[PDB]
Every structure is written in structure tokens, then in C-alpha cells.
RNA sequence: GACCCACUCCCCGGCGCCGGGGGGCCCAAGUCCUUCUGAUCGAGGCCCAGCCCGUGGACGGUGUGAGGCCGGUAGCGGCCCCCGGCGCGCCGGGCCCGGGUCUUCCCGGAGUCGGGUUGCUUGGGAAUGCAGCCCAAAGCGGGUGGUAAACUCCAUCUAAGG
RNA sequence: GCGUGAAACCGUUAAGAGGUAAACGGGUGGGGUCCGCGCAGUCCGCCCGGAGGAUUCAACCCGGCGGCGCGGUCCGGCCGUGCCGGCGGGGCGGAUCUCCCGCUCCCGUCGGCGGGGGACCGCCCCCCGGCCGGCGACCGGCCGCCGCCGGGCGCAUUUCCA
RNA sequence: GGGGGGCCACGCGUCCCCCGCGAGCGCACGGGGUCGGCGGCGAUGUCGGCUACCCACCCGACCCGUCUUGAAACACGGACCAAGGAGUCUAACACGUGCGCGAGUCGGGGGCUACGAAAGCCGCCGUGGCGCAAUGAAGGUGAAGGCCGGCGGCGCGCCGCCGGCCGAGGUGGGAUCCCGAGGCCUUCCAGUCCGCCGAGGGCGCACCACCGGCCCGUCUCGCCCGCCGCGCCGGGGAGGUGG
RNA sequence: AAUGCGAGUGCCUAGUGGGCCACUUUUGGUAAGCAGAACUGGCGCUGCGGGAUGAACCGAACGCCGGGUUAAGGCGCCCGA
RNA sequence: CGCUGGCAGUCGGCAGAGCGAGAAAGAGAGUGGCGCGGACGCUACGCCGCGACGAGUAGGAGGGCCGCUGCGGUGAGCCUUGAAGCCUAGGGCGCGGGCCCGGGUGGAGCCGCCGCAG
RNA sequence: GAAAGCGGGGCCUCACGAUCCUUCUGACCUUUUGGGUUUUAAGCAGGAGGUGUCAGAAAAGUUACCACAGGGAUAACUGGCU
């Protein structure tokens, strides 16, 4: 996601500023050089970035380099990426609501009969 | 750094007293004896201490040299001022201002040195 | 930080969140000091409203 | 830490956070999952749809080990072997293709979800999906079946 | 009474569970007791290995584990008979034997035979009479260098055969794996009914001739 | 930081000997009293003996 | 049974001798000078052996609060008894022994299995286990193969003795 | 039934009070009990004036110590989550490759596989040269300036003391 | 426009339409009070002490807890005092928050080596749990494509078939960031560097709304492709719909 | 169009689910301090000034104070005027 | 409560003391025509400045240098020249929970701060 | 109906019913467990058999011999309003 959000036109030779953590994503083969400022960088992402040839800064280093944050691209992770957000919204067992229910386990006989089948009762 | 170890010692130091809605410090080189970042006598690279002499008369002025910071045996230089009440007040002020040695403690050093000389007078 | 622990299986020293921690020397550096506005250290207390009438 | 709990701030308040009118009685609606059909039906239908009834066939002596088939997508296909396996084929000129044994890494079926880098592979797997074998043939490669 | 949103939980605390509570406060006490018993046994059998008899190379059943290999209970009688070791003498020299095991394959059989040969090459056998050596036993220079083995005897390690990056041939590029899987599944599913329909076709058409 | 000084090995008479050891990188690890307190107050409960009426 | 190869050492009981457990006794150093108290175990000091011992600064007692007053504590510390194990020599006994390839023979647990029905039990669902009654076996047999039944192959054990 | 000895309740002494049961909130007043160890009322800095007293000021000399140094770039060291090189030596790791050795199928020949090298790659450690950058979590000697101390010289229109 | 009193009006030198620094000195309806003004008393009877001991007066003032629409109630509990006395622990789940590591993470079970029954270590002890893949009752299946050239078929487009190149969607809103028409004064214009602002124009984070796309189940319409078994075989397309 | 105001959005969540009174509208009843509705405001959950007294009426809602002025009420005496 | 306000500029003989003012932006660089002196501050979890506001049952949240008992650290803490406890017409602090001193009684142990636990 | 069109019940506003079980219908449908064939059985999908206390327990009395937790949320006295 960092590669795609810094691959956009116009934003070359800029510092990607991350407040969270830069984690490695292993389903990508080529890493270009990147000037990175983050609170934390994981050990295998750090190796890939430094082998690509970029720099990894901390926030005091960013404050020394660009005090006003010029030539920077602020980035943030997907906030709805957590599993907690699939259980949120309109309640399950309501028409047109694709909300994940809370089950002790998933399977054939775990909440699949009365509110889910047109055969047994009704379907929302 | 001084800020870094101040964030450790600001609340859980052994020199700290918190009673009667006041806070202080029993630190050896804390002139004004209060718990603060500016007046803390051990976190800084350049500290000034003003203490009474071992015998009845005189004022001992202590500085911290820049070379041995992890070497507390030879870190502090000590001088003894057994003079009149005015030339010691010129001398300590010279030692701070002309040497540019931690210059925001000069009036605190003079006010401590006046109090030591007042305490070494005969009582009424 | 470049050589891993040899008697442990896979342990490294932890990374620093902040390399230069002496923020006094950070703040009174010419890199930061030029990109600041003028300090507004004048205290403006309240004005007793006299009746102009 | 009981000193951080709500009980220490509830000393002096008569009903202890539980109400003057409706008291903290013992079980005022039944015990456990009582009344799923009758008086907790609205909660059970508004939050647990499908909870009552029978669906599907029974299987008496089901052992989970027979249907063991762990899957790996093709975007994780190159993480099973080392990096010097991958870069040596990139610098290679004779067209030799490295062999990835996913049963050795602990996978049985290969599904094809992500991209593959433009270099030949020989994937040995117990099962393949159709898009998984076509993405390997399109990049140029072999899908070897093993038992 | 249920709250707004949550799981339907079934806690199994409806019996008198507080009577049968097993606490683990004697766990660091039983670890020391097991360690002292282990060291007392290791001192009791002084040149014999501390783990015990050697366990054979064994495949695991039940397809989740059929790729791994394991330590079994004992060497089979076929394996001991091929290796040339009597079954009532093998237990006296630290070879674990069970007679229940069968040998369906050849490769595991010869692997355990090689396992027995390599252990027999490593066995340092003391004389039954210490004052007088015998025929089938070790010499005096090996008994003074004979020590006690720590850990399992000849530990069992899962090996994987490394293969060269091979050049893909034209017939390997033509193999349709998914089509082969689907047609093999269909031919396994439809084998009996096809043979029965062929039997009916041969039975209805032979009535025409007679 | 990254600068590792050269600590001197002292003899049993109190004076410095000729041996110098470079400072290990462990001494430049971050200082986290909150994590030290969290580890200490959770690991100090592990030596406790049970009490009950 | 025959053909070959290979064994001269296993067990117990006494006689006598060789290096963990229980018990008993003991093992360092201040009551040193000033001083508070009703009594000190308090306080101050003991130089350049930084009072003395420390592998002993756990505890308890002693007229408050003691490493050095006492019992103790530390120590691969000592001394003195008793019991047992681990071994050697000898006597009186036993035991008079094996492995491999062919050849000829032999081989199994019954009012039990199993079936019906009844009742209890189990997660076991056309019956998981147990028991009562009735029926009641077979020997290329019998049991199991988590849906009752027929046919046909397979796989796997050998119940009703210890 | 004897450490400490609370409250409820009671006796007595002392003080105060009393016909709207007692008690209470606000606001004062009076009388007591003690306290301020009250009862001639704060000191501090500078300057001026008047009576005194010191072994005394500034400036110079010697010695010690400290600070700073863009000593534009003084000599020498140390470090680098710095970067390149090498007729360099080494350890870990690799799903990058490949002379002896056990065992195996077929005649000491001939093929697969268990096992140590050997090569390759990555990282790290230690020796070499180069710059870069740091010594403000990490400096030494000379030199320059400034400050302080001690000892001289200062013989008092200076400085200090009440 | 022509021929006595108040004006925050007081330059010189032109072109031309209408006919950039003077110093001083004081006063004060001016960014919240000062006096550079005073007087009495004070050592055995007086000074100060709001609070706390007692008493007096004026005004106010019904006994608390609880249930209740409503309690001072002729509603219940209560003579008085001391001590004890009531949302705890375990398990499970949800959500928030802090820490560590991070597509991984976790030794909880086991093993090694006074406090210490602690702490440390294991990695071919990561078995195993949870997460990384869903969907179907199940057999099972299992998460972008587009363009071009050549060939075959249908009657210029489509389908199938081999080679090349491009490549993980778009629209609207969107913190932040990028460019810069022009400009931010000292005697006057050109004039480079360092900054600062800015009309307008862009790449657009997270997130939301929407339109597309892909995976599994199911329905409808259909034409094709594969070979070791040519088949009640296997694989695909288009359009809705359930997860 | 005027007037005024920073908005939008997501989790977790206690208590409650006996109510009562008043202007106006209004059902049953001879009527009720009766029973039952609509709207708004109250009481409940709330003290304060006034209605002598007082759940709901009139005024007005509350941090601790000094000065001034009022509301609803009042101004012979209790009792401020 | 809000201004998601202000202060690291204590920038001193290596000095020049400022950002309250109706009007987007620099007290910018270069290029040509004696006397050795200057209050306080800043526990940044700190300090300071402007406004507006303050009812409360059931209930919820936050802050307690409020209180009790025990544990790990720490006060070169207190103590037979008198600890805990108890009494008090004594002096006080804090809105309050409560706390600190003085007198008496008593005769042996007790407390403050940083965390932990009930 | 010539066609435009109209019609997937009644001109509109009522005439009706979950899970579990049973029964019928539908597919060259899935499973029936080590495999194959055939009955049987279990599934998937759509109707029905019914809960009228109609969001759906399977249910007669008596107590002056009586018992408990409560209620002035509720009667039999007085007192109130009328
Ligand atoms: Mg409350
Ligand atoms: Mg209650
Ligand atoms: Mg509550
Ligand atoms: Mg309730
Ligand atoms: Mg409850
Ligand atoms: Mg019901
Ligand atoms: Mg609730
Ligand atoms: Mg004692
Ligand atoms: Mg002493
Ligand atoms: Mg003692
Ligand atoms: Mg001593
Ligand atoms: Mg002794
Ligand atoms: Mg002794
Ligand atoms: Mg001993
Ligand atoms: Mg039986
Ligand atoms: Mg029974
Ligand atoms: Mg049962
Ligand atoms: Mg069978
Ligand atoms: Mg079956
Ligand atoms: Mg048996
Ligand atoms: Mg048996
Ligand atoms: Mg006593
Ligand atoms: Mg007594
Ligand atoms: Mg009297
Ligand atoms: Mg009155
Ligand atoms: Mg009540
Ligand atoms: Mg009532
Ligand atoms: Mg109420
Ligand atoms: Mg009441
Ligand atoms: Mg009454
Ligand atoms: Mg009652
Ligand atoms: Mg009573
Ligand atoms: Mg109590
Ligand atoms: Mg969480
Ligand atoms: Mg209720
Ligand atoms: Mg009514
Ligand atoms: Mg309200
Ligand atoms: Mg009101
Ligand atoms: Mg009236
Ligand atoms: Mg007023
Ligand atoms: Mg009146
Ligand atoms: Mg309030
Ligand atoms: Mg009292
Ligand atoms: Mg139609
Ligand atoms: Mg009709
Ligand atoms: Mg009767
Ligand atoms: Mg009756
Ligand atoms: Mg009753
Ligand atoms: Mg009533
Ligand atoms: Mg009546």
C-alpha cells in the first residue's frame, strides 16, 4: 500500500510520513527506494527498504529535516481493516444487512435455520 | 539525554519529597532544592552547586566538567571561597557569566551564596 | 543492532522510536529556528470598561 | 486491582448502581438462554438469525483429519522457497525453472489469487484449482500433481 | 436475560464443578520429582543411554500427517529377521521390539534394517564377565571411552530431497492438472454404475442371439 | 544513540588496568520504566503462595 | 527327526571381607571504653590489621530493638553407634541348556458368541455399553469396519482363561 | 479475671442556664478556658555623614584547576542503526550447486541414495587504504583567550568589618 | 456659482481636468489605588483570637432510612453505645484502552540448567490454538483483465486457437502535500540567492456514497473446447439472484 | 429569502418500562380529589419570592459573597413597605 | 467548559532585549548607478492569559497530597531523652473526605513518597 | 379480443398460522461412511396436516384443617370527594 500510494504521479522524491507502523507485505517482489518516516518499522520491512536503498527516519529526524513537513505525503492504514467492523452496522436478522453475527463456531448447525432459510420460517 | 532521564526521575526519584501540597528535592547539586528540569543537579551536563564549607566559614562552589560524564569520581570540581560577602558574589557571577557555564542559574547561585553567608554569621 | 544474539535463538536489540532525544539541542537548532513565527509573549489582561458616557 | 473498580466509588450510594424502583433481583428473566422462543424472541431474531431448527445431513463418526487440505494462494507461492532461489532464476539465462514443493511447506491445494512474477515455475501440489493452473501456464510453468 | 449484541454461550457449570477442581500448584514440584527420577535412572544404567532403547523409523497415518516421520514403539520381527537379530536377544542390547507391527512397504522395511545395522555398528558391548572377555563383544580400548548418550538414540529427523531447477519440457507444459483431477474424480465416482450398465447392455443384447 | 565508548577494566586494588572493553550495545537500549514496571509487577506475582479460608 | 554352526557360565542360600538412612556429642567473633535506662540488645568511638569473625549478617532466647551473651546458622566440618545397599573370595547346592536352513506333524477358551424382546445407560443417533427372559451357533470360522437389509470383494484383529 | 482502658450509662466538683419538650441553620453579643511565651513594635539593599578596627583593594609575578576554541582546515586517538575498495583472514545461515564414504539393484567394473569437505550467495567479526561525519548518551597533549583558587608584591584617599 | 464666528485648513516649484525620522519640557476624566497623610493607647490589667466551651436574643426551622404519583405522617424499621456486616472469585464472550511483536503471534504442556514453588533457556520441542479464504445440506468448488498480430469457423463483427505488449477499476467529496500569475518598502531602478504569502491549477491518505469487476450456491438462455479411459465424462460463456 | 447556530459520524452503555397534576379540546358517568384520551408545560428529579398553611398555582429555576434594581405579590399591627 | 489559546526567546561584551496590530507576506543577504552589569520564571503531567457557564432523583464518568491492611522499592526516615492506641474549654490547614502540631495518658513499635494487592 | 390491450384470483378495505415431527410432489440431484450394485434411510426445494390464549405449554376440582412470599398496585370498617 505504501508502494501504490507513493507510485502516484507528481509525488516523486517525497517523504512518506506514517504515524502508525510500517509492516512488511510479502506478496510483492520489487521494492523501489523510499524515504520513510514512521514511529515503528518492522524488522523484515526495514531490511527490504534498506536493501532497496531508501532511508528510514524517526519523527525527530523528520522535524530536523522538514520542520514544516514540506515534500511529505501523509499516509494512514485502513481504519476499517479490523475484524471488529464486520459485526457493526445494522443488525443481522434484518432485511438487507450483511453483518457478521457473533457465533461460538461456524458450521452447518450454527445459526443457519430459521432466520436464514425460506424453508424454515423466513429469510430477511 | 537530560530530558530522557528527567522523564524517569520526575516522579520516582529517591530525592523527591511530596507533602503539605509542596514538592522538593534533596539532591546534592539542586540549588533552590526544588524538583524541576532546570534546577535538577544530576541530569544535566553542566551543573552548578553552592554549599557551605566543611568548617565554619566559606562557601564551596562545585561545577561538573564536560569530559567525565560516566565517571562520577572525577566529574565534579570544587573550589572554596573564604572571602568577604561581596567579592564572592562577584566571583561566582564571573564563574558563571564569563565562562558561559549554564547561565540561567547565576542569580540562583548568588541567592544561595548570600544565604550561606547569612547563616554563617553569629545569631542574635 | 546489526548482529543478532548468538546464545538466544532469534533475538535482536529493540528499535528506537526516537534517535536524538535531546530536544533542547533539537529545538535550538538553526534548522528549526528559522521556520518559526515570532513569539507572542506579551500578556494582555482584561480591560476595565469605563463608561464613555 | 480492586481499587480501580466501580465498587469503591459506589460506597454511600444506597442501590449500588442498580436502581431504586427495579431492584437487583436474582433472575428476573430466567436463567441463561431461557425464553428464546417466548420472551427473548425479539433479541434472538434481531441478533441470532437461524438459531432454531435443523439444516443438513448428519455425519456420525466425523474425523477432521480426512478433510485436511490447507491452501496457499499464488501470491504466497514465492515465499515458501528462499530468496536466492528466486533471484538466481531471474539472473539465470538457460531457462531452468525452480521447483516449489508446497506439500513440504505444508499445503495441499494451490489456489490462484494474486499475481505471479514473470519467471517460470514448477509447482508440485496435491490439488490445483483451474485459475491457479492457468496463471502458472500463462506465466509459463508446470503444474505437477503429487499424491 | 440477554444484552443487546453478543454470543449465545453455553457454560458447562451446571454440575457441582467446585468439588472436582484440579489446581496445578504442585506442577513445579512434580517437575523436580520427574527430573530427580530421570537422573536416578540415568545413574542406575551408567553406560546405557538415558532415553532407553532405540525406536524405529515410522510413518504416520491419517492424511494430515502422512508426510511426516516419527519414532515408533518397536522394530518388527521382519526387520529383525532381515537384520539378523534374534527377537529375545534384541531387548537385552537396547533394541525396542514390538510384534504387532507389520511391513506393508519395502522402503520403510529396508530403512529400519539400515537403522538396525548402523546402531549395531555403534553398539559398544561390555563382557558379561568383567574379568574375562568373550567372543562377540567390544575390546578393552572402547570400554574406557564408552560414555552415556544424552537424548534419543539416533534422533529421527525429517529429510526432504532437494531437486535442481529443471528446464520445463513441452509435455509438462501440456499437462492439465485440474482437468485430470476432475476426470479422475468422475471416473472414481462412476465406475460401478458404468460396469453395471455395460453388464445390462451385454445381457440384453445376448438375448437377441438365442 | 550509536556511539559506543571504551570502558576501562579496573583492578582489584581500585586503579585502572590496561584492559579496555567497548561498551555493549545493550546499554544504548531505550529506557521504558512503564514496561519495566509492567513486567516487574506481573512477574512478582508468580512466586506467591495460595491462601484461602 | 536329520544337516550344519556355536556354547562353557546363569540363579539362590549361608560363612567371612571391601567403600545412603537414623541417632548422640561438639566446633568463629566485643559483654571492649564513654554514655541513656528500672533493665540494655539503644547512641557515640575503637588509628595506618579502616574494633573482631564472616563458606557463619537465617531465627529464637536473654530485664527495650544483639552477627560477635547463649542455643543455634555456614561448612564435599569432625568424632562415636546402628541399619541397609553396592561387591569380592569360598562352601553346600542346583541347571546339564543354544542358533540357522529344509522335511514331517499340531494348533485353541459354548447356555459363550450372535438374534429377538424388555429395562437402565451412553455423544452413540433403525439400539454405545450392561442386565433379565426366550432362541441359540459356526470353523476358508467369528468379531469389527459409527444408517436397517441382500449380494460381492477387501482391510483388521482373534472374544467367551490369567 | 490485675497491659493499654474508648463509647453508651452513672456519681461528684467547677462554670453557665432554665414556664412554649429537647436539639438545630444563619447572624451577632456577653462570659469563660487557654494561646500569641504580646504590652513600645518589621527589617532588607544602595548612598551620604560621624566615630573607630584590620595585615586589606586594584594592577603585576609564580603555581594549580576549570570553561570555550570556525587552532578558517594544530597533532594524535576512539566511535559510527556511515559509505567504497583487498595478490585479506574467520564464523552463522541458504529450498544456489557438486572428491572420498556407509548401504542398495544388476556384472574389482556399473547406477540411485544416507554422509563430510569443496565452490557460490547473504549477514556478521577481525586486519588493511580512502573519504564522510561525530566525540552534546562517546577525548588526550601543546597553543590562544577568559574565569576561579592558593602563595608573593602591594602599606592604604583603595578594600572590608561591626 | 458672482460681486462676526468656527475650520483634524496654513508649504514652496511645476505637468494636469473641472472655472516617509524636528527635538525637548511638563499637565492629565487616558491600558483596575494610592498618600513623598495623620491620631490615640499600651507589663499584673489590658490588646488580638473569625473557628472551639457555655449562655442570651432575632429570623428560619416537622425525624431519619425506605417503598411510592404523593411521607412530618394516624404507612413499616429504629431505646443507646462498641465491634462485625453485604457486587466478590473462577470460567466464557463482547467492546474500549496500554504494551510487545507483526502476516504472523503465543510455550500456557514438556524438557535443560535462603529468596528460588522464582528467574533464564529450548526452535527439527510451534505439536497445537487463533489469524492468513470463502461458500454449499453435500458431493465439491474456491477470489481482474484488456489490446495487437497470425490461423480456423460463423456472415464487417463474433467465437475458438498460438505468439507479443500494456497492465489491479472508475466517479464525487476529501485532512495533508506539489507547482506558481503576482508580490512582501526605507533615497532611486535593474538585478542573483535565502525565506514568506498567494489568484488559479494538480497528485490525492483514511473514510463515506455510488457504479463496475472477481469467488461459492441457485435459476434462465445457449454455443463451443479437451482426451487414457468418447461418456448419464470433464471444462467453459451471457444475464439475474442468495453468502 | 429572513433570522440564528460549528457540524457530521461510529462503538459500548446504565437506569426506566406503576406515574400524577394544570389551560384548551374531549369520551363514559347525575357527579366525584372518578375512570379514559390529544397537545403543551410542570410535579416526580426542584430548592427560592408570593398564594397564612401547601407536590402541581403566580413569578422565577439554584456555585460562595458585597452593592443596586425588580417580578408575582403587597405596604393599619403581627410584618419589611 | 471553550479559545483543539500563549510560553523551549532565560536567544547577554561570541549582547542588543520586539511581535495588540484595522488591511496575504522579511526589523532578509549580498550585486550595479571608561564602568564586566541585566528581578521572577519552565514540578511543559508545569506555568500563564481571555471569555462563557454552574439545579438534580435513578444512573454514568472523572479527580482525590481522602482513609484502612499487607508486599516490592525508597526516605544514611521516626523511636525507652518515649512508638502504636486513647483523652483534650489548646493552635491551625483543607469546599470536603480528612490531616498536621501542643498538653496529658501509655510502655514498644511506627510512618512519608513511587508502584503492587485486597 | 379484429386489435390496442387486459389478466398471474374475487372492484378496494378482513376471511388466517413458526420451529420439531409427519405426509405428498420435483431432479438420469447429494450422502448412506473401506469400495461397488440394489432396497431402505438421511438431505435440498415447494404445498399440506396446527397451535382461535390466533409470534404458537400437552392440563379438572376443593380446602371453614390450611401454609408461605407479599400487596393498601386490590375488596370487606371508619374517614375523605360526589
Ligand atoms: Mg446517585
Ligand atoms: Mg433497595
Ligand atoms: Mg448500573
Ligand atoms: Mg431489572
Ligand atoms: Mg444480576
Ligand atoms: Mg406464548
Ligand atoms: Mg440490562
Ligand atoms: Mg531479641
Ligand atoms: Mg554500639
Ligand atoms: Mg540476635
Ligand atoms: Mg556491632
Ligand atoms: Mg557462639
Ligand atoms: Mg556455635
Ligand atoms: Mg550443619
Ligand atoms: Mg456378551
Ligand atoms: Mg437407574
Ligand atoms: Mg440418560
Ligand atoms: Mg462391508
Ligand atoms: Mg453402512
Ligand atoms: Mg487374553
Ligand atoms: Mg486377555
Ligand atoms: Mg510488655
Ligand atoms: Mg487496667
Ligand atoms: Mg450547679
Ligand atoms: Mg418564626
Ligand atoms: Mg419501604
Ligand atoms: Mg399508596
Ligand atoms: Mg419514583
Ligand atoms: Mg420520609
Ligand atoms: Mg394522617
Ligand atoms: Mg412492608
Ligand atoms: Mg419499633
Ligand atoms: Mg465498624
Ligand atoms: Mg483489545
Ligand atoms: Mg415496576
Ligand atoms: Mg385521570
Ligand atoms: Mg427534568
Ligand atoms: Mg418548580
Ligand atoms: Mg389561601
Ligand atoms: Mg442581592
Ligand atoms: Mg402580608
Ligand atoms: Mg451541578
Ligand atoms: Mg469531647
Ligand atoms: Mg408476466
Ligand atoms: Mg368480478
Ligand atoms: Mg365446615
Ligand atoms: Mg369456602
Ligand atoms: Mg401470609
Ligand atoms: Mg389504595
Ligand atoms: Mg369509605
Provide the fold topology.
This is part of a larger assembly, with one copy of chain A (124 residues), one copy of chain B (124 residues), two copies of chain C (53 residues), one copy of chain D (147 residues) and one copy of chain E (210 residues).
Chain A lengths: L1 H5 L8 E4 L2 E2 L12 E3 L2 E2 L1 H10 L2 E3 L1 H7 L6 E4 L49
Parallel strand pairs in A: 1-3, 1-6, 2-4, 3-5
Chain D lengths: L40 H7 L23 E3 L9 H9 L7 E3 H4 L3 E3 L9 E5 L1 E2 L1 H10 L1 E5 L2
Parallel strand pairs in D: 1-3, 2-4, 3-5, 4-6
Chain E lengths: L26 H18 L12 E3 L9 E3 L5 H7 L23 H16 L17 H4 L26 H4 L3 H13 L1 H14 L6
Helix pairs in contact in E: 2-3
Chain E binds six RNA strands through α1, α3, α6 and α7.
Subcellular location (chain E): Cytoplasm
Family (chain E): Belongs to the eukaryotic ribosomal protein eL13 family.
GO molecular function (chain E): RNA binding; structural constituent of ribosome
Question: Would you give an account of this structure?
Answer:
Chain B is an alpha+beta fold. Chain B is 27% helix and 20% strand. Chain B contains three helices and five strands. In chain B, a hairpin with a 2-residue loop joins strand 1 and strand 2. In chain B, helix 2 runs antiparallel to helix 3. Chain B is globular and about 40 Å long. The radius of gyration of chain C is 26 Å and the shape is elongated. With 147 residues, chain D is of the alpha/beta class. In chain D, 20% of the residues lie in helices and 14% in strands. Chain D is built from four helices and six strands, in the order H-E-H-E-H-E-E-E-H-E. A three-stranded parallel beta sheet of chain D has the order 1-3-5. Chain D is elongated. Chain D starts with 40 loop residues before the first helix and ends with a strand. Chain E is mainly α. Chain E is built from seven helices and two strands, in the order H-E-E-H-H-H-H-H-H. In chain E, helix 2 packs across helix 3. The longest helix of chain E is centred in the N-terminal third of the chain and has 18 residues. Chain E is extended. Chains in contact: A-C, A-D, A-E, B-C, B-F, C-F, D-E. The structure holds magnesium ion (50 copies). The site of one magnesium ion has 2 residues of chain D, from loops. Chain E binds six RNA strands through helix 1, helix 3, helix 6 and helix 7.
Strand content of chain C: under 5%
Shape summary of chain D: elongated
* Strand content bin of chain D: 5-15%
The helix-and-strand class of chain C reads mainly alpha
| Series of H and E elements of chain C | HH
- Rg of chain D, rounded, reads 29 Å
Bound molecules: magnesium ion
Protein structure class of chain D:
alpha/beta
**Biggest interface and which pair forms it?**
D-E, 44 and 27 residues
Q: Roughly how many Å apart are the termini of chain D?
A: 57 Å
Summed up, what is this model?
By secondary structure, chain B is of the alpha+beta class. Chain B contains three helices and five strands; from the N terminus they run αβββββαα. In chain B, helix 2 (87-97) packs antiparallel against helix 3.
Features:
part of a larger assembly; 6 chains; A: 124 residues; alpha/beta; 4-stranded parallel β-sheet; 3 helices; elongated; B: 124 residues; alpha+beta; 3-stranded antiparallel β-sheet; two-stranded antiparallel sheet; 20% strand; globular; binds magnesium ion; acetylation (chain B); isopeptide bond (chain B); ribonucleoprotein (chain B); ribosomal protein (chain B); Large ribosomal subunit protein eL28 (chain B)
Amino acid at each position: 500500500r505504501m508502494i501504490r500510494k507513493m507510485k502516484l504521479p507528481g509525488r516523486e522524491n517525497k517523504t512518506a510520513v506514517v504515524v502508525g507502523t510500517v509492516t512488511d507485505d510479502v506478496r510483492v517482489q520489487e521494492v523501489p527506494k523510499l524515504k520513510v518516516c514512521a514511529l515503528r518499522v518492522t524488522s523484515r520491512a526495514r531490511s527490504r527498504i534498506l536493501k532497496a536503498g531508501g532511508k528510514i527516519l524517526t519523527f525527530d529526524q523528520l522535524a530536523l529535516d522538514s520542520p514544516k513537513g514540506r515534500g511529505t505525503v501523509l499516509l494512514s492504514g485502513p481504519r476499517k481493516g479490523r475484524e471488529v467492523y464486520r459485526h457493526f452496522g445494522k443488525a443481522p436478522g434484518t432485511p438487507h444487512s450483511h453483518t457478521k453475527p457473533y457465533v461460538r463456531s461456524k458450521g452447518r448447525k450454527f445459526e443457519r435455520a430459521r432466520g436464514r432459510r425460506a424453508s424454515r420460517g423466513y429469510k430477511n | 539525554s537530560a530530558h530522557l532521564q528527567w522523564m524517569v526521575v520526575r516522579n520516582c526519584s529517591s530525592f523527591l519529597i511530596k507533602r503539605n501540597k509542596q514538592t522538593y528535592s534533596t539532591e546534592p547539586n539542586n540549588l533552590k532544592a526544588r524538583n524541576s528540569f532546570r534546577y535538577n543537579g544530576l541530569i544535566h551536563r553542566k551543573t552548578v552547586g553552592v554549599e557551605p564549607a566543611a568548617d565554619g566559614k566559606g562557601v564551596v562552589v562545585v561545577m561538573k566538567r564536560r569530559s567525565g560524564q560516566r565517571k562520577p569520581a572525577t566529574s565534579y570540581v570544587r573550589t572554596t571561597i573564604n572571602k568577604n560577602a561581596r567579592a564572592t558574589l562577584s566571583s561566582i557571577r564571573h564563574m558563571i557569566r564569563k565562562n558561559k557555564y549554564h547561565p540561567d542559574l547565576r542569580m540562583a547561585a548568588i541567592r544561595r551564596a548570600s544565604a550561606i553567608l547569612r547563616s554563617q554569621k553569629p545569631v542574635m | 543492532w546489526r548482529k543478532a544474539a548468538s546464545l538466544k535463538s532469534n533475538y535482536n536489540l529493540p528499535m528506537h522510536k526516537m534517535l536524538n532525544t535531546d530536544l533542547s539541542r533539537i529545538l535550538k537548532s538553526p534548522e528549526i529556528q528559522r521556520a518559526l513565527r515570532a513569539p507572542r509573549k506579551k500578556i494582555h489582561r482584561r480591560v476595565l470598561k469605563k463608561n464613555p458616557l | 486491582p480492586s481499587r480501580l473498580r466501580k465498587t469503591r466509588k459506589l460506597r454511600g450510594h444506597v442501590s449500588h448502581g442498580h436502581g431504586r424502583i427495579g431492584k437487583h433481583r436474582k433472575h428476573p428473566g430466567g436463567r441463561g438462554n431461557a425464553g428464546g422462543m417466548h420472551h427473548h424472541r425479539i433479541n434472538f431474531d434481531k441478533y441470532h438469525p437461524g438459531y432454531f431448527g435443523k439444516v443438513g445431513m448428519r455425519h456420525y463418526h466425523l474425523k477432521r483429519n480426512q478433510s485436511f487440505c490447507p491452501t496457499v494462494n499464488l501470491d504466497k507461492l514465492w515465499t515458501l522457497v528462499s530468496e536466492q532461489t528466486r533471484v538466481n532464476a531471474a539472473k539465470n539465462k538457460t531457462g531452468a525453472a525452480p521447483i516449489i514443493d508446497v506439500v513440504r511447506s505444508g499445503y495441499y491445494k494451490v489456489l490462484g489469487k494474486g499475481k505471479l512474477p514473470k519467471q517460470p515455475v514448477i509447482v508440485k501440489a496435491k490439488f490445483f484449482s483451474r485459475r491457479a493452473e492457468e496463471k502458472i501456464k500463462g506465466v509459463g510453468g508446470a503444474c505437477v500433481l503429487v499424491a | 436475560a440477554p444484552s443487546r449484541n453478543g454470543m449465545i454461550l453455553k457454560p458447562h457449570f451446571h454440575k457441582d464443578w467446585q468439588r472436582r477442581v484440579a489446581t496445578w500448584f504442585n506442577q513445579p514440584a512434580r517437575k523436580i520429582r520427574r527430573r530427580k527420577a530421570r537422573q536416578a535412572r540415568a545413574r542406575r544404567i551408567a553406560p546405557r543411554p538415558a532415553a532407553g532403547p532405540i525406536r524405529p523409523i515410522v510413518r504416520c497415518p491419517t492424511v494430515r500427517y502422512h508426510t511426516k516421520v516419527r519414532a515408533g514403539r518397536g522394530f518388527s520381527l521382519e526387520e529383525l529377521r532381515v537384520a539378523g537379530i534374534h527377537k529375545k536377544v534384541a531387548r537385552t542390547i537396547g533394541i525396542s521390539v514390538d510384534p504387532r507391527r507389520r511391513n506393508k512397504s519395502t522402503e520403510s522395511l529396508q530403512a529400519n534394517v539400515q537403522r538396525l545395522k548402523e546402531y549395531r555398528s555403534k553398539l559398544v558391548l561390555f563382557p558379561r564377565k568383567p574379568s574375562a572377555p568373550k567372543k562377540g563383544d567390544s575390546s578393552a580400548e572402547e570400554l574406557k571411552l564408552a560414555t552415556q548418550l544424552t537424548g534419543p538414540v539416533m534422533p529421527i529427523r525429517n529429510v526432504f530431497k532437494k531437486e535442481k531447477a529443471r528446464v520445463i519440457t513441452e509435455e509438462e507444459k501440456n499437462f492439465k492438472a485440474f482437468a485430470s483431477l476432475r476426470m479422475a474424480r468422475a471416473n472414481a465416482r462412476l465406475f460401478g454404475i458404468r460396469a453395471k450398465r455395460a453388464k445390462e447392455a451385454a445381457e440384453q443384447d445376448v438375448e437377441k442371439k438365442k | 544513540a550509536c556511539a559506543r565508548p571504551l570502558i576501562s577494566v579496573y583492578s582489584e586494588k581500585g586503579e585502572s588496568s590496561g584492559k579496555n572493553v567497548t561498551l555493549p550495545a545493550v546499554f544504548k537500549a531505550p529506557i521504558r520504566p512503564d514496561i519495566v514496571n509492567f513486567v516487574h509487577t506481573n512477574l512478582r506475582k508468580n512466586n506467591r503462595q495460595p491462601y484461602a479460608v
